[PDB]
Amino acid sequence: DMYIERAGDITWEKDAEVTGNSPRLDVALDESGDFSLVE
Amino acid sequence: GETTDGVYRVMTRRLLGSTQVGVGVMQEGVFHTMWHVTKGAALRSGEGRLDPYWGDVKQDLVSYCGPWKLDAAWDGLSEVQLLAVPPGERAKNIQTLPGIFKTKDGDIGAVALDYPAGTSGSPILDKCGRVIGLYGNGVVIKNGSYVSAITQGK
Numbered sequence A: 001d002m003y004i005e006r007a008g009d010i011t012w013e014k015d016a017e018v019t020g021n022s023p024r025l026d027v028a029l030d031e032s033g034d035f036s037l038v039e
Numbered sequence B: 001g002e003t004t005d006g007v008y009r010v011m012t013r014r015l016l017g018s019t020q021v022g023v024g025v026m027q028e029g030v031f032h033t034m035w036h037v038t039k040g041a042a043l044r045s046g047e048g049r050l051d052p053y054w055g056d057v058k059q060d061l062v063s064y065c066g067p068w069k070l071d072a073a074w075d076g077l078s079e080v081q082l083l084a085v086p087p088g089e090r091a092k093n094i095q096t097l098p099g100i101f102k103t104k105d106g107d108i109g110a111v112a113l114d115y116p117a118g119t120s121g122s123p124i125l126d127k128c129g130r131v132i133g134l135y136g137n138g139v140v141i142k143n144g145s146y147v148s149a150i151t152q153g154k
């Protein structure tokens, strides 16, 4: 049995940790809602 | 029950202790999460019930109490913030420039950030604080790292 608890406001934060790259990927989305890589 | 706008943890007491299975966004009286987090089951907020309203396994989305309210989109150029809510850890913003998921049905933004499975449903925001999608459905590359789609209703 699931429950919810508030964890914070939804706001943009100036000078937050800036990380992560931007890859361009050929993907496929199946009937079950799962992504898979194409090559 | 609590209906204040914001990011929420989705918890269960079925397994050992209290386990966080995901995250959701409360906006305009409607709770929004990913389908794989709740599997369409009802939710609790204090002594109040949240019944599902709309769901779709292919989009991997679900709304509670009303229709999907999140309509903002990634502009395809600017950085965004993942407002990550990891299990047992405080809400943390992480700024990144999204990559792209190229599909036969069109291009979708993608964020290359790796977080525990219980972080699924964490909102991705634009510079105005608007939710442009939910984090948590994606793919795994050669390097073992995780790339999530920026999943928005429709």
Ligand SMILES: O=C(c1cccc(F)c1)N1CCNCC1
Pocket: B053, B054, B063, B066, B067, B068, B069, B153, B154
């Ligand atoms: O909740 C949604 C929805 C889903 C995704 C995006 C959107 F704008 C709306 N419903 C249910 C009721 N009307 C039909 C669609």
